């Protein structure tokens, strides 16, 4: 998720090598945007990384 206050772009990460990587384009709006990767599942731990 590419969020500013609310998500502008949500995409599925795709596996290559050993990493989930995706390439896309940045929307027209300027500001401070952050990437939230939040993986929450039934049984797994909660993953959360925001840059």
């Amino acid at each position: 998720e590419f969020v500013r206050i609310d998500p502008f772009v949500r995409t599925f990460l795709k596996k290559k090598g050993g990493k989930y990587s995706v390439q896309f384009k940045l929307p027209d709006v300027y500001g401070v945007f952050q990437f939230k990767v939040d993986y929450n599942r039934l049984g797994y731990t909660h993953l959360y990384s925001s840059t």
């Binding site: 039934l42 049984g43 797994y44 731990t45 909660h46």
Partner: protein
């Protein structure tokens, strides 16, 4: 002083109170990370029935009761509404906190 009393699913090895409850492997959580991959035979249980909030994001329910099991004092007659009367009787219940504490 309460117990998960069930009158349709009691094992033969009981004290005549039907306190022992045989829980089937159907009403489980159905997540292979918690309850393992294999197929399980019906399990045995003798304990106090708890309940959890339906709109609770953190709580889990590893093993609910059966369809007719109720939790109330085995000696006293039922006067109030019994706590966790149906399939919302919880037997095994887990929590995964915000710090990932199991």
């Amino acid at each position: 002083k309460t117990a998960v009393i069930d009158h349709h699913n009691y094992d033969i090895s009981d004290l005549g109170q039907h306190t022992l409850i045989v829980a089937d492997t159907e009403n489980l959580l159905k997540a292979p990370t918690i309850v393992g991959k294999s197929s399980l035979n019906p399990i045995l249980f003798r304990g106090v029935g708890m309940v959890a909030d339906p709109d609770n994001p953190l709580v889990l329910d590893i093993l609910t009761g059966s369809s007719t099991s109720y939790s109330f004092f085995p000696d006293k007659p039922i006067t109030q509404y019994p706590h966790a009367v149906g399939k919302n009787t919880l037997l095994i219940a887990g929590l995964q906190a915000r710090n990932n504490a199991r």
